[PDB]
Design a binder for this molecule. Structure first.
Ligand SMILES: [Mg+2]
Ligand SMILES: [Mg+2]
Ligand SMILES: [Mg+2]
Ligand SMILES: [Mg+2]
Lengths: 338, 338, 338, 338
DNA sequence: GGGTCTTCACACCGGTGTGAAGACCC
DNA sequence: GGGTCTTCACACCGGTGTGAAGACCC
DNA sequence: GGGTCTTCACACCGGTGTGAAGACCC
DNA sequence: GGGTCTTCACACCGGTGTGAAGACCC
DNA sequence: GGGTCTTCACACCGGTGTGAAGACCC
């Protein structure tokens, strides 16, 4: 349920409850009395609804109210069973709500993917929400595969092994001096679908919830493309940060300045689009600070300089995320052999 | 006082109290009931004592107990006047304690500077704490000037204007495309003293406290060297971070990869030492992650590759900070015309 | 509860509260305003959990944090009802915390006993915590009975009355000159189970808490073996001292040098293992000082000399106490008729 | 001064003040804000007066008021300079007051020694306090040397090296098995004066204070008899404990049961008198518990059994300590060749 | 490179909670 | 007049000052 | 029998369902 | 109309949930 | 002895104090 029905939380199980009492089980470093089950809170509120693509009153809501609703949905569960004992620290209400923004917004553009994949293969343009049809020539080798990425991923394992050896040579070349290229992985990698999946139906079946069946699918769809995509076909890379501070905006820059060195450079990609989706850009001069030239090209003169960040987006609603991702596919997929 | 005398807090003024009640004055975005006066808490505990160089029982204390003592010194003030009302948020107890680590540790190596400046000019080797004499030839053109840096500083204003024009050409060259080189400033910049100050006594008078007289001196000594030092004479750059997480260790990397591009490169410095001083490296694989090659040299083949971080230091005491900074000056100042 | 739930202390009774206000009832010698209920604090924190054998995050915690947690659990109760009045003297926070160490650590090896008794009688090797199975031949006349001992106990009343008369003859022989053999009793006496209890189920039912039902069982299980065990079958004697000073380590020596005279000697035991379990051995040269030969054998030449203390143990966790007591039973119970 | 003159504490030096502020000098384990100078507090109150032998109104005072007066003399100093900051922990008010009882009571029987030494050599019987003359034949080889002993002393170094080799053989014999004979030293060892000092005037000059001149004399007079006294001439051994608890009375038993084994036994002393001087025997059954037979003789049958403690004394005044020590010398020195 | 100084073990009692034997009428 | 209740010894560690051996350059 | 006390009108916004005009592609 | 004062970006760590590699006997 | 389970690094934002540039009349 989306609006905290009082009996479905009493019809649920203790395993699938929103908050597990770990007051009789510390974990040796943090004295966490109560924890917020991230995988259960997503299955509770967004379990039978998806923002952007369902129940258009939700799709016009403020996107700072869709994200951050499972956190207040968990507090109203916590003040029901654990009366007067309930405390969740504010540093725990930001980790989960940041990860809610990481998963849910990736699940909205998954629904934009499967509707884009429908129009490419000759199927119609689902019009249950009023979304405008893209004006591109429908070709089956244009469907896109959006992929959520894990915490310790390194993203080189998606490239074809004829191209993966150059990066491994560049990495093991740095290992001779005792060095390396450590990076943080971006929260979202948008790549085009390879040849082996041009008739598979798992890239067109639109998702209708965020239950744990269709939740390990989205965290685990990356493994089916592990070593398939050419380096010139990684279209978009989306870093997800819920709010920005005047120093936390630099950790996506080091995500891009490695991504614009191992692709532009050793594997010869032209330019990979890297962009940041935020909700609270206030308190920072972040739009000016994201006008940063990439440090990769600053050594070989002024041959080709460009931005390290494509755009800094502030989605006002959930449906405005889906409208932007359609116009992104309407322009980037023009430049392939349709 | 260091150990919370009960009457000096009652002999103090309401202006110089450790905590001002701003409960009748909000600031329109944060509902801060009580604030921690950072400039007053440093003047209260460390007002007549300096770690490392005074009262050797303090100098052998755990350095996580020296830093973080003004925060608990303020709580014991807050539970005295404002009984039962007192709440300071944990996100406010980290900003001040991080800034306490930024100022106090810079004030310890200031005392290492003025004793190094004494042995260079022919004065003796003050031995009130048992610190070993450096085995270098005493030359007056070897004394070092340690400088705390502000929040919006850009550090190019320290270079001589014959060398400052190249960086301004490289910056305004990027401004033609609507770009830039934004950076965070390091918390400490260690440079050698220029020719105009080789007889001045403000670089040898050892500081004996952290009162507001000798506090705007340390935050403001950088302006006296604004446009004096050659680019090949910036010896050490110290970034101060009290604890590290698996993503907050990247914001000093972007501080270094710009510092190793505007000095190595456009102004031809050989290699500028950049190092991070932390207290809690646990919960991270940060020593392996700080074995990162600089992204500046990764474009022109493999001409000269090196680390972007020199060392990751964990000071066990306060006197072990002073012992390391003496051996750093014992090695780096060998390579000048003594 | 283990981590101070705010309403179970409000759901508790005034009788079973953690701190009774005796401010309207002095006791004629000590002006104790507030007292720490030792029997209630054990029932509050460890009431539904046992260290070593439950909730393995607890079992890996530092053992100086398990013991000493009911003392800080009582302070957080005391600053709730009795606001600003609350003072417990530090000499009262050591007596209870020392007695907490006396009872809880005896209750951990009781759980090691009942699992050892299960494998001896043919029942399985409970594996809810991952504890290694002992490699001994399972015989029913090998199960062990661990016994907590009171404050004024004299431990001779456990021996069979055919052997108790020799000690009473030696005691009443000394009473003719107006003398005696006064001793302090050890906090723990580990003896093997007699013939009358080889089918009883009270030595195999594992304890699941420290509530006052299963608390007078552990302080009172000694009376069921009052006059049953032969003198050659007292395997281990454990003295419990939370921290050691350079003179408080001698009061277990006089506990051993009487125990190694009334058993080795008048009742002909070979050697009784006597060992001290401590948490803070710092500030002492106690490991060298516990290499003391027993004063019993120093009169008849050098016939048989040995240590008065077997080992000085420092348990790092709670599960490491259970691992040591299993390997102790794996070696000492080899030397009986299995 | 004895009764806290307000200007002699202001005429004193900061070095010889009763309390040094170590608030700017921790000592890495204890957070001692203010310390009680033990060597200065004895020089302040008892600096020009000695109990028992001076100003007979003092000598009739309660002996729990003479001892424990420098502790309250220090508190009245501490609430004068350090207003409202002053806190000395009760665990620090017992260590010093116990050591005050250790030094002052040893200094009273030093005055009984030098008056006993005067009557032995033919000098008169000083009668400034009305003390009864002993009825013994005055012989010069009967004068006694009372010795305060340090903290890490082992008391074997007082015996003649022809007798010291047997104990060293017995100790190194135990070292072959990795053992030893660790002991606590008694606070006072009373031995008879050897042949080399039968005309020296340092054993007859009566002490007239406890200033630091005549304070290192009393802690350091033991070194002049280091290896001089035969084992059959150690008359009295006094252990000093201010109050007794039901387990702290055993640490003098282990002091005696080694002293009644290395002297009775290996060096053939008949019986060495060992006694405990206490002020608060309440709360214990200590008089019955000090009726303990020595564990040395309990192995060779019932050849010769005796007490390990001679007497447990409770001195009501200071002059009653001097009256007991005169009657002790009136009986023990009858049994030498007068 | 024997002096200065930072460390460490030494032995220091005191306010304690609880069980068992005392107190006292009925 | 065996019950209730007021007492008492039991064994409980923890913050300590000072001497002697450590630390370290010169 | 003017004080005490039980009553009453005053004016206080806030969460609402439905029709009609908006929104948007086709 | 240069002073006073109200604002804002700066850089500040800390308590976190989950996946994957560790731990350990059998 | 491959399973179960105890651990750990990963990447997660949010409430902050202070300096410098803004605001505004005079
Ligand atoms: Mg992120
Ligand atoms: Mg920093
Ligand atoms: Mg004990
Ligand atoms: Mg003593």
């Amino acid at each position: 349920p989306f609006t905290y029905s009082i009996e479905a939380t009493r019809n649920l199980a203790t395993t699938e409850r929103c908050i597990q009492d770990i007051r009789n089980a510390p974990v040796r470093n943090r004295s966490t009395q109560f924890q917020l089950a991230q995988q259960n809170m997503l299955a509770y509120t967004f379990g039978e609804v998806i923002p952007g693509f369902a129940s258009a009153g939700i799709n016009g809501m403020d996107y700072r109210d869709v994200i951050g609703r499972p956190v207040e949905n968990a507090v109203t569960e916590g003040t029901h069973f654990f009366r007067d004992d309930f405390r969740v620290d504010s540093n725990a209400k930001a980790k989960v709500a940041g990860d809610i923004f990481e998963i849910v917004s990736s699940a909205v553009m998954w629904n934009c993917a499967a509707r884009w994949n429908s129009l490419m293969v000759g199927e119609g343009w689902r019009s249950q929400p009023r979304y405008s049809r893209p004006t591109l020539s429908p070709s089956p080798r244009r469907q896109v595969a959006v992929l959520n990425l894990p915490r310790s991923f390194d993203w080189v394992s998606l490239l074809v092994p004829e191209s993966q050896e150059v990066i491994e040579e560049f990495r093991a070349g740095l290992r001779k001096d005792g060095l390396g290229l450590p990076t943080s992985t971006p929260d979202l990698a948008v790549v085009v679908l390879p040849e082996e999946f041009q008739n598979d139906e798992m890239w067109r079946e639109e998702i209708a919830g965020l239950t744990r069946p269709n939740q390990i699918l989205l965290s685990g769809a990356y493994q089916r493309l592990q070593g398939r995509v050419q380096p010139g076909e990684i279209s978009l890379a989306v870093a997800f940060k819920r709010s920005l501070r005047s120093d936390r905006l630099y950790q996506p820059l080091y995500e891009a300045n490695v991504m614009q060195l191992l692709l532009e450079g050793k594997l010869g990609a032209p330019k990979v689009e890297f962009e940041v989706h935020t909700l609270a850009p206030e308190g920072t001069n972040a739009f000016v600070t994201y006008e940063a030239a990439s440090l990769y090209g600053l050594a070989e003169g002024r041959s080709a300089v460009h931005r390290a960040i494509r755009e800094l987006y502030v989605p006002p609603t959930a449906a405005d995320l889906a409208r932007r991702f359609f116009a992104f596919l309407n322009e980037r997929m023009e430049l392939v052999n349709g």
